[PDB]
Amino acid sequence: APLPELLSNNGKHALMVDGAPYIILGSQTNNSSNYPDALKDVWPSMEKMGANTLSIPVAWEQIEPVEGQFDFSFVDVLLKEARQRKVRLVLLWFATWKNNAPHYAPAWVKLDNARFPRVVKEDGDTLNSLSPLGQNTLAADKKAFVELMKYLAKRDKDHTVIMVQVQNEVGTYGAVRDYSPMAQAVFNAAVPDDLIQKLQLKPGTWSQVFGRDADEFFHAYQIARYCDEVTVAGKAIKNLPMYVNVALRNPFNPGLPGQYSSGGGTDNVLHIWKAAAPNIDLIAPDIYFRDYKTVSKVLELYTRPDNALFVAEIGNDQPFARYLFPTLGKGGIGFSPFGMDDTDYTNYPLGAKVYNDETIEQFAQVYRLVNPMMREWARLSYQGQVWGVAEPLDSTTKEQHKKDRASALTQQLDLGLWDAEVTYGRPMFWVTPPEGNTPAAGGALIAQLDDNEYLVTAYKARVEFKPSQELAGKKFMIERVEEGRFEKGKWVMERVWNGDQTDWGLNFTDRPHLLRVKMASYSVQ
């Protein structure tokens, strides 16, 4: 079975699984479900969601509870149970950092500060965040991580685990960097020539080279170097794709490093992270912003020629489901709502206030649009042209305001010879202006099959096609709309949309319909 691998060519990306592009339609457990007994409270949600991939912690404390005494009993049960249900895994290495802290390191690590030292603030007080310049901590982390990758090498020959997250939300809250004597001696010295060269700067000390950014850039570099060494070590055993997940700073008004998790893959240090950690496949945003404009900005910032988009975490409340559409539209490889288990916990106000079948259904309904075409969509996104949108007004908390909302709820997409107009919250007949869904929930996906032909599926929206350029006196129409499915990679037609179903755009409710739309311009001379 070919190793999973993250491919990057001509500004596009693909997660190869079993020798073909793959989309993670994911679900992540709560933080305390990484035990054999908890899995019974995980699988039912995953089945109701229709997820294809489960993200779940593997904690350093549980594989090495006593130094040198490894315990993979949980990984054994997890692999077995995942294969019975024919789903894949993303393991989350919870080790030196989990939300800035060492809580998931073994007691023999997190209680021995002299061996495994913490961030010291400028005032000399100590934060519960392990310093990236602790060489013992780096060696011990790597050692245990290598043993986990050895376990996968020997016991996961068919790659049930497709990707590994190295640490969980690295960084420090409460300070910008380590100010320990140890860290001070490294900070008061020359910037590594390798960072100097890879970045277009001039040789000198950290303060000389970076000025006002020296403290935060230093923390990012040293953390990025720690996480690269761990990643190189593990890849040496088994070369799986490996990524880091970011405690986002607000992109539009971040405040100061330390209010947000300093030293993580924040938007302002993606250049240090990419220069300092070339072995880490991608940097993934953890999205809990509710407002469309902020979420949209995060997707824009994390999708780069050098960075595949993977929404490694997103809130599991209703408004977040629709962001699947712009995530896949940007060439996203995956999307994983956080806390999708029945272990009696909710991260409200971040996620849903109540976890129940309705909570899961909001995501099941969007994943039902993509599951039937997952391999075809993944290939089109890598090799060709895709688009995706979400309803761009959030749920509400006179005559003019209705015109203003109608306009805001109308999106244009340039598909080459054809444009699509996407509108939200209106009847399936006639042209009454959009008033939006209550709550906000719609979105659309389009892939280009040919100059005049598109794959379309959408949710609580209307999609309408039109020419992209004025025609030289020709007219245009829909040539054919087919609803169908892929079987063995072949298109099977179920029915033709026509008449009422294509007079007033293409109207989608909550049910899944995958369309092939063929447009034509025609002479009337």
Ligand X SMILES: CN(C)c1cccc2c(S(=O)(=O)NCCCCCC[C@@H]3NC[C@@H](O)[C@@H](O)[C@H]3CO)cccc12
Q: Which residue ranges make up the site for Na ion (CB under 5 A)? A: 13, 331, 381-382, 414, 468
Selection from ligand X, Na ion, none that 452 binds (CB < 5 to 8 A by kind) is: none
Nearer to Na ion, 133 or 390 (CB): 390
Binding of ligand X at residue 267 (CB under 6 A)? no
Selection from ligand X, Na ion, none that 169 binds (CB < 5 to 8 A by kind) is: ligand X
Selection from Na ion, ligand X, none that 279 binds (CB < 5 to 8 A by kind) is: none
* Cis, peptide link before residue 4, omega less than 30° from 0: no
Nearer to ligand X, 86 or 353 (CB): 353
Shortest spacing between CB 145 and ligand X, in angstroms: 18
Shortest spacing between CB 391 and Na ion, in angstroms: 23
Binding of ligand X at residue 343 (CB under 6 A)? no
Residue 219 belongs to what H/E stretch? helix 214-237
Tokens of 447: 């892939």
Shortest spacing between CB 395 and Na ion, in angstroms: 29
* Residues from 284 through 313 that contact ligand X (CB under 6 A): 286, 288-289, 313
Binding of ligand X at residue 210 (CB under 6 A)? no
Which position among 350, 417, 428, 478 is part of the footprint of ligand X (CB under 6 A)? 350
Nearer to ligand X, 99 or 468 (CB): 99
3-state secondary structure of 39: helix
DSSP 270-317: HHHHHHH-TTS-EEEEEE---SHHHHHHHHHHH-BTTB--EEEEE--S
Per-residue three-class SS string for 85-148: CCCEEEEEEEEEEECCECCCCCHHHHCCCCCCCEEECCCCCEEEEECCCCHHHHHHHHHHHHHH
* 425 contacts 434 by C-beta, under 8 angstroms: yes
Nearer to ligand X, 29 or 381 (CB): 29
Which position among 99, 128, 207, 318 is part of the footprint of ligand X (CB under 6 A)? 99
CB count in 10 Å sphere of residue 14? 22
The single residue listed with the structure tokens 């990484």 is 34
What would the x/- binding string for ligand X be over residues 35 to 74, using CB under 6 A? Answer: ----------------------------------------
- Rg (C-alpha) for the chain, rounded Å, is 25
Binding of ligand X at residue 457 (CB under 6 A)? no
Nearer to ligand X, 313 or 317 (CB): 313
* 141 contacts 162 by C-beta, under 8 angstroms: no
Binding of ligand X at residue 365 (CB under 6 A)? no
Shortest spacing between CB 361 and ligand X, in angstroms: 21
* Cis, peptide link before residue 439, omega less than 30° from 0: yes
Single-letter amino acid, residue 78: L
Nearer to ligand X, 259 or 509 (CB): 259
Binding of ligand X at residue 168 (CB under 6 A)? yes
What would the x/- binding string for ligand X be over residues 242 to 261, using CB under 6 A? Answer: --------x-----------
Nearer to Na ion, 12 or 150 (CB): 12
Of the candidates 425, 445, 451, 438, the one whose C-alpha atom is nearest the C-alpha of residue 509 is 425
Which position among 64, 169, 281, 391 is part of the footprint of ligand X (CB under 6 A)? 169
Residue 48 belongs to what H/E stretch? helix 43-49
* 178 contacts 129 by C-beta, under 8 angstroms: no
Tokens of 253: 């008004």
Selection from ligand X, Na ion, none that 307 binds (CB < 5 to 8 A by kind) is: none
Tokens of 478: 């829909």
List interacting residues with ligand X (CB under 6 A): 31, 99, 168-169, 250, 286, 288-289, 313, 338, 347, 350
